[PDB]
Design a binder for these strands. Structure first.
Lengths: 301, 301
RNA sequence: UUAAAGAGUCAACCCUUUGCUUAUCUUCCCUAUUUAAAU
């Protein structure tokens, strides 16, 4: 039956870095200034479901903030992304299962996956809720001593483009067996003077602060996993629910509380076992299996 | 019964900026000068109720003051207000309850909420206790390269006006779903020569200073919560108590110690449960549910 | 209530010897977000 080995895992083939935020002007984007974090204390009422009696009591909280300087009206977010090859190479286990999985795969078209991966960056999906309130977002991508500038709208409903396709074919060739390529990504906004920026939060136990933000040497930054999550939001190949989601086994959104691709014969493990055991798959299923194999994880139990 | 989910929260759709104050002249409002704070020491008596034996002793305090310079006679306070649509969309949970609430809503008119939000800024209600002492108040409101000047009195008893409608119509157009609109607000006052100003305070524990003031780089300013709270004081929609209060689940004023809209079959959570379960609400109830929904917070448990 | 009765006392060298020891891959993966006037 060629069952999967008890220990089986894959590495991460898309490596992002921690994004850095700077405050620049629209016409003076050469000189950059860092953004501090700080800490403030606020007061408010107690509006909790189930306790009408204590609605007249106060509430004191300590939080962290992040905003642009009042003399600057442009936010610049810069980071680096690395795409590496050598896909279908298990790090733990695999002497027959991995080879059969590779033979069943690699007939798929990496062009669509590569185009969507680059489009998620160029259109401006990698940057989170900071998007709102901006009248102009400019994306600058540097690779192989060749710069590209994008002002593309319509973050959803991936459309056709000429500049994105040029990087797409470059990424597609690297994905199906090559060395590595790198992309330097910069995002420019037009939020305004004194506007609020939303860096990444983190899990913290009980302390003196109720909301503390992530920072490096006191400068507001964003986690690399958050940047990576927005890149792989290309799972459009299921029955309904447009505005797609990230590619994960049992493709689920914890924030919404729903779990698509449940136990109804559409699973990563079901398709993986089916691919090696005789019958092949369709194009969309191959697109999901390859995209989920580019992402890492442990596949065994 | 379609009970609320465990996690359910909505973001804030109105974004105020930290208002900054400058000292200018009545007919020379072109050039502006910053206002400092400094530190002073004061002396007085001890007035404590219930302790008459120690009323003959002194009292020394160290505080912060802020007054406009002796060469100016007017204060200009400026900020920005951003309105963002995409209401009736919960970022924390909600696939059926949120959708049912969205379906039950938009049967009423956003025009009243849009008119009131603009009128609160226009009348000068955003200006705090420092209103007194000035015989003339001016407001300059700028949006889409179109400036308007306001000198309207009677902040209470919302009346009809012509220029307010030309902004309220667009605000009603942004509230029921589209992108962002940013407005710039400036206020001119006539306190006089050497009059003391009243910037925002902070919550601080025991230290050498008994009362300090919020300032950015040595310049007195106001918290964004102070700016945003005065705008939403539109709740003229219950049994009594004219001169309304701000919208809040179990709307209470900790300053007065009384809790309006208490457990008397009029609660925001009760209206949310009732609207989705068959029988709808009245126009005023919808105008309160929507007003509380525009404001952020978490509703669940 | 097998009731009634009764001095165990004295004295002491445990000494001597010792090699524990050789080899080693912990790997893969990840959205913490949602607000509020200083008493």
């Amino acid at each position: 039956k060629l069952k999967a080995p008890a220990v089986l895992a894959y590495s991460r083939k898309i490596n992002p870095t921690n994004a850095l935020m700077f405050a620049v002007n629209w016409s003076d984007r050469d000189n950059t200034t860092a953004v501090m974090v700080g800490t403030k204390t606020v007061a408010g009422t107690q509006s909790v479901r189930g306790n009408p009696n204590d609605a007249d009591k106060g509430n004191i909280q300590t939080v962290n903030f992040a905003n642009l300087p009042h003399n600057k009206n442009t936010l610049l977010v810069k980071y680096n992304v690395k795409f590496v090859g050598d896909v279908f190479k298990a790090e733990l286990g695999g002497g027959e299962y991995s080879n059969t999985l590779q033979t069943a795969l690699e007939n798929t078209d990496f062009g669509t996956l590569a185009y969507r991966y680059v489009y998620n960056i160029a259109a401006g999906r990698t940057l989170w809720r900071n998007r709102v309130g901006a009248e102009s977002i400019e994306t600058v991508i540097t690779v192989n001593d060749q710069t590209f500038t994008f002002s593309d709208l319509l973050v959803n409903e991936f459309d056709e483009d000429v500049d994105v396709a040029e990087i797409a074919d470059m990424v597609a060739g690297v994905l199906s067996g090559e060395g590595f390529v790198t992309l330097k990504v910069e995002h420019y906004m037009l939020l305004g003077e004194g506007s609020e920026v939303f860096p990444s939060q983190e899990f913290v136990e009980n302390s003196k602060l109720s909301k503390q933000l992530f920072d490096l040497n006191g400068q507001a930054a964003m986690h690399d996993q958050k940047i990576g999550n927005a890149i792989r939001t290309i799972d459009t190949w299921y029955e309904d629910a447009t505005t797609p989601i990230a590619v994960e086994p049992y493709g689920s959104v914890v924030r919404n509380g729903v779990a698509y691709r449940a136990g109804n014969k559409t699973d990563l493990f079901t398709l993986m076992d089916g691919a090696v055991n005789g019958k092949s798959l369709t194009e969309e299923d191959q697109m999901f299996v390859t995209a989920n194999l580019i992402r890492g994880g442990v596949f065994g139990g």
